Amino acid sequence: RAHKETLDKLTNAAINKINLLNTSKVKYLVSSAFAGLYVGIGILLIFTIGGLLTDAGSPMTKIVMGLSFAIALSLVIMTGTELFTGNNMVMSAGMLNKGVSIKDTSKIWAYSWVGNLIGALVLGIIFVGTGLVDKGPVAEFFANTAASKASMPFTALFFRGILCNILVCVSVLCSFRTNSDTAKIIMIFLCLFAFITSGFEHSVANMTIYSVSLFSPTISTVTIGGAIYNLVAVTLGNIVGGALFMGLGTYILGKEKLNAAAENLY
Amino acid sequence: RAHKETLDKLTNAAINKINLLNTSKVKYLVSSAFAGLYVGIGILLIFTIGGLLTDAGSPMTKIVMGLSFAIALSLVIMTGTELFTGNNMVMSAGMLNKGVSIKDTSKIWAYSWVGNLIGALVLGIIFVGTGLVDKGPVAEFFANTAASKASMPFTALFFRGILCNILVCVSVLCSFRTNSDTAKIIMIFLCLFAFITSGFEHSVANMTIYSVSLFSPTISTVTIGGAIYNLVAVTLGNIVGGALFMGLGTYILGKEK
Amino acid sequence: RAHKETLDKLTNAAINKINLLNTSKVKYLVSSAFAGLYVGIGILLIFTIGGLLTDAGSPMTKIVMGLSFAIALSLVIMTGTELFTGNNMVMSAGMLNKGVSIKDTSKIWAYSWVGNLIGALVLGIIFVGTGLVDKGPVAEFFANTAASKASMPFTALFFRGILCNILVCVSVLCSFRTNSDTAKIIMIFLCLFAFITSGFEHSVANMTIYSVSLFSPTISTVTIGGAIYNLVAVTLGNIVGGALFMGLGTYILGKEK
Amino acid sequence: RAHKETLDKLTNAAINKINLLNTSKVKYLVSSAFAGLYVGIGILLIFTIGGLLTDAGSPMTKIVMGLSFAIALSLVIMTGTELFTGNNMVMSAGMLNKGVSIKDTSKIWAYSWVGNLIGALVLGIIFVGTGLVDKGPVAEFFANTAASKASMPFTALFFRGILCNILVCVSVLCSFRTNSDTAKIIMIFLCLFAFITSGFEHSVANMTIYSVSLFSPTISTVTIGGAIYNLVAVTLGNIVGGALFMGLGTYILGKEK
Amino acid sequence: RAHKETLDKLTNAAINKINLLNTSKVKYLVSSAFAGLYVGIGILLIFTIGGLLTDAGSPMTKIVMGLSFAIALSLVIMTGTELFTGNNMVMSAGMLNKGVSIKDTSKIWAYSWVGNLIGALVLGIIFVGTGLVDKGPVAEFFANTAASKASMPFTALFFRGILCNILVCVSVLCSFRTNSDTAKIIMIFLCLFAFITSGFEHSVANMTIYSVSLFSPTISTVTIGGAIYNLVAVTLGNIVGGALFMGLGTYILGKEK
Numbered sequence A: 001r002a003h004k005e006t007l008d009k010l011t012n013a014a015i016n017k018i019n020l021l022n023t024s025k026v027k028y029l030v031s032s033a034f035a036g037l038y039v040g041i042g043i044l045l046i047f048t049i050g051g052l053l054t055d056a057g058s059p060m061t062k063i064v065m066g067l068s069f070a071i072a073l074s075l076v077i078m079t080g081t082e083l084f085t086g087n088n089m090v091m092s093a094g095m096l097n098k099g100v101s102i103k104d105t106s107k108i109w110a111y112s113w114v115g116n117l118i119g120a121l122v123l124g125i126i127f128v129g130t131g132l133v134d135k136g137p138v139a140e141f142f143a144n145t146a147a148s149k150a151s152m153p154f155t156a157l158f159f160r161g162i163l164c165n166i167l168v169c170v171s172v173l174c175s176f177r178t179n180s181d182t183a184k185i186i187m188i189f190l191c192l193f194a195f196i197t198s199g200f201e202h203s204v205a206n207m208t209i210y211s212v213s214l215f216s217p218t219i220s221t222v223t224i225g226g227a228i229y230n231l232v233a234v235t236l237g238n239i240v241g242g243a244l245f246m247g248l249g250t251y252i253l254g255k256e257k258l259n260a261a262a263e264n265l266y
Numbered sequence B, C, D, E: 001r002a003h004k005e006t007l008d009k010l011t012n013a014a015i016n017k018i019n020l021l022n023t024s025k026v027k028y029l030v031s032s033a034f035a036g037l038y039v040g041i042g043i044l045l046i047f048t049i050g051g052l053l054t055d056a057g058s059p060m061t062k063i064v065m066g067l068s069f070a071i072a073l074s075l076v077i078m079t080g081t082e083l084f085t086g087n088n089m090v091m092s093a094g095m096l097n098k099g100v101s102i103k104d105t106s107k108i109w110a111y112s113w114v115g116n117l118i119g120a121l122v123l124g125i126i127f128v129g130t131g132l133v134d135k136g137p138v139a140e141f142f143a144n145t146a147a148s149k150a151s152m153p154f155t156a157l158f159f160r161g162i163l164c165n166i167l168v169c170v171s172v173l174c175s176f177r178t179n180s181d182t183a184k185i186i187m188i189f190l191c192l193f194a195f196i197t198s199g200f201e202h203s204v205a206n207m208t209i210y211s212v213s214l215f216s217p218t219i220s221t222v223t224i225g226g227a228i229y230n231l232v233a234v235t236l237g238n239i240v241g242g243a244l245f246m247g248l249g250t251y252i253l254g255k256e257k
């Protein structure tokens, strides 16, 4: 346990993010574009597996998918690129610790979200171009899943988004709490396995699911209005999970009782 | 044989725990709540697996569940949060070695247990709101496991609680004996694999098994007395394993001539 | 972060490649022949798996193939040898950073591509002499995959090439951002799993698919023009993925404005 | 290479073991009882797996059991506790190297073996009390395995005991030759997978097999004479494996010329 | 790249090998006997797996065998012992680099191969003594594999030997290029997976195949003439793989010229 020094690290990470965005908007967006595409890469893989195993009628489908998703956030952490869902915790913590402002935060949130989206779009276009989604069980898996995510009640999506970002941000948190790159990756594998297989909802990952589906030639049963719906619900859920739970939580754990230079702890 | 070193570390962690509690009840409770929720997260995953593979008739169900539970304690150890079952060995070793009093130990136990339960209630509530336990195999898996755990005889729950916490605490003990975070996670993986697949009982994990089931409107036979009955029996077993075996054992190996 | 240091690292690597080729063509080409052979070894392993599981009607075939391909880039990275696809990002980043020139880049690309191919030819020849492709499902998996890769339309091949090298180059990128060799190998394993199972195309691996198919006794529809066609389409796609995305992207991330 | 430094370290461990026993019999026996229990925990896990998979008619049963046994020696090594079988190599090398006496070695063997059995006995008692061996495939697995282990000809048991302790002791030798805890656990995992799946015999793991089978009222296939018969023949082969092969061998590798 | 550094490490290792042999024949031979037996342990495990899964008609047999062979060379590398196949690259590179003579190289090859053989013979005898090859699918897997290896044409064996020792030697080369013991083991794992599942031939592993096959009364399918035929062809292939590819290749990469 050193929660204080962890709090200092999240604060420094928040500071550097806003400093970077102010410095170069292109640098910051390109960083966010990579991250969105890196996450999407995980989606292409596990949806391929979904199509493959669903068509075969395997009971192991959802387990294999979760076991296979680690690459999404592992690429993000190992490239040091900008992922919206992680910024929920980092910027929240930083702000409570007075390193960054509410404006600084909404800004990072806004642009990371947008750049991630750009990444998914580019990935979506390129993947469809491969013809792997022209016809088949994988194409169908994208179709069916895109539809289900858009057709499900806001409350359900909302809560799934909370639990997702608790898991995604806690893996990010572990990355702050260890110097071992291999331990980072392992904690990410565990958290992404738990979140994918348990059926929680990740906003950035969905950007690619719909990106691929709306760019896909075969029918739709998608209704881009649906994509927006899903994305709104999951995003707010994510924010709560990251900002309300992990951000505030790590702040509470690490803030020195002294200071006390504002507020007092029971 | 770093046994004296190890006991010095347990004792120091025990001291740090109670000082934290005395310094801040909110910080102690929040840390406890996180650890309760992180463990419950393991349960959500392995019960999803449980539902899926049970409904398939697979012989691999309990093996895959065991292999998949590592995240529970991995998250706890890697976040530095407060977990009741682990405090059983730490506070007992630290007390035997005169770093902390019995009152300190009793308090730390009461508070982490209550913190953990709070974490489980929040998780159980939020999980239910996802609608994932509304209906189907995962819902049924919660409903049936909760019931069999609440109706099992006391001596059996108790002895299962003993073996579980020997495994949970020995994995915490390993984390004190290595500087390698990967090796910590590996040993956690092994010990949680052994305890889940063998059929041992974890009090804090059960808190989520019960919060989910009770909070789920999809019908169940457990109730509160059922949940309380299991929790009491498993907690007592957990304490015996952690304190009487691991705490006393490590104190004996580590104590000064 | 450390994007600037990462760009410095790629620029330095890109500089050392051209300096090496300028000092010794033999060394450069020997290094390239090794890498081409190391990648092809991954192809032998997973096509053997392909032949085995396809024959069995397993739904797991492509998944097991992906999980088992890690050796291909792990060997290259752990031996420090010269792979054409990795050089798409390294040389493009170093070129934008003015460590090396465009001519340096096309020279390095030409030499590593050809040297890679020499390794593939050598490997295919020796593999055929083992008798392991004389007949049976492995021989058939080689014939069938070669045929389908060569008969696929250009656009599809090109885009699969793009996504393949994004993954391969981002694995190399990771190897520059960690001092942990285990972490390098793990990231390579994840990226190669993703690209093999997703259906993406790697020019250098395809060299072995084709040298094996064309050197072996078992009759196919492939021919030579087919191999060349596939290799042209996938190479261009690989170049776009490694150069336009990873090379340009890491340069933009690390460049002092 | 470091054969000399390795022998030095084995010698030192032999010296530290005898000193520990001389200083405190209790500390020594308690360490021994932990190790015997930790080994036994691996048996509880894999016999659970055995009952589940056998009951299912799985061809993978013995493979999954081997893969799942690593916890047994991993716990011992990571907690630094006293295991009879490892002491076959350590004491024999140490004695050969003039660090410890023949009588010292005899004493460490007797105490560690008996203390290990104390751990198995205690574990068997508690595990029976879980009700997990009451009736079903896990109880049948214990009962069937214990009977076949007690009815197997001496020669076959003895030789199985030799190969077993070459594997266990070589995994302890590896832990002496690396500073990476993660690599220690990997090597233990491999060697334990090899010995369980191949069919080799480990005296201390067997103590738990017989303690569970004998303490359980719903298991009557063996009795005590059957257990002694097996344990005597497996212990003798263990000794030969660890002392005559590993101990003598590493001494010959490391000794001053 | 650090190709010169690697060649220097290889050259130092060759020098150290020949000094060892010159210093003590007994030490050199004991070391070789260990490696031969450690490699054979891997054979005992994967042939138990082969017999189990072949008898069940599993498509996964050769895949699980390849995945399970890592112990063979992991033990050799972690105990620092003398393996003939590895010495093909090490002595070869150190010779080209003028650290050791052609005669030193012949000597080291001769002694390690014979020593490796002594370990295989001992392991064979003891394994037969376990009764584990008395009868059933494991004995039959041994009998059938020995026979197919004995009847295979020379060219096909030779080329299989080449590819096998590229893999074994590149895995040894990897261990000279990293300070991470976990990474060494991982690369060894991947290379042995590749060579076993693909169908490549390893001379020292084959020693234990024929050892068990010739010592078991219940295995009739082969003669000493067959074993010798296979061992000669496969050894020659191994030498070409280790010395002419890896040895010469690494010399070329690393030579200051």
Ligand SMILES: CCCCCCCCO[C@@H]1O[C@H](CO)[C@@H](O)[C@H](O)[C@H]1O
Binding pocket: B103, B106, B107, B110, B111, B114
């Ligand atoms: C909002 C939730 C707050 C939970 C705090 C629980 C307070 C318990 O407090 C402690 O309980 C122990 C026994 O149960 C006693 O032994 C201690 O003396 C006592 O301080």
Ligand SMILES: CCCCCCCCO[C@@H]1O[C@H](CO)[C@@H](O)[C@H](O)[C@H]1O
Binding pocket: D029, D103, D106, D107, D110, D111, D114
């Ligand atoms: C409660 C546990 C008591 C354990 C006591 C074990 C002591 C055994 O005693 C030892 O036995 C050997 C042979 O039997 C002798 O050769 C040793 O000299 C002797 O010290």
Ligand SMILES: CCCCCCCCO[C@@H]1O[C@H](CO)[C@@H](O)[C@H](O)[C@H]1O
Binding pocket: D117, D207, D210, D211, D214, D215, D216, D217, D223, D224, D227, D228
């Ligand atoms: C060293 C091997 C393990 C020894 C275990 C001895 C426990 C015996 O104890 C008793 O004996 C009877 C038959 O054995 C059983 O029927 C009883 O249930 C059991 O309590």
Ligand SMILES: CCCCCCCCO[C@@H]1O[C@H](CO)[C@@H](O)[C@H](O)[C@H]1O
Binding pocket: E103, E106, E107, E110, E111, E114
């Ligand atoms: C158990 C006995 C094993 C002894 C093996 C010795 C075989 C030596 O063999 C020879 O050694 C010479 C130099 O020493 C080489 O020059 C020869 O090429 C080589 O054949």
Ligand SMILES: CCCCCCCCO[C@@H]1O[C@H](CO)[C@@H](O)[C@H](O)[C@H]1O
Binding pocket: A180, A181, A182, A183, B182, C180, C182, D180, D182, D183, E179, E180, E181, E182, E183
């Ligand atoms: C089951 C297989 C998982 C293996 C994961 C290995 C991760 C180990 O961790 C790594 O190990 C190295 C030790 O050799 C260290 O040098 C590194 O610091 C460390 O990150």
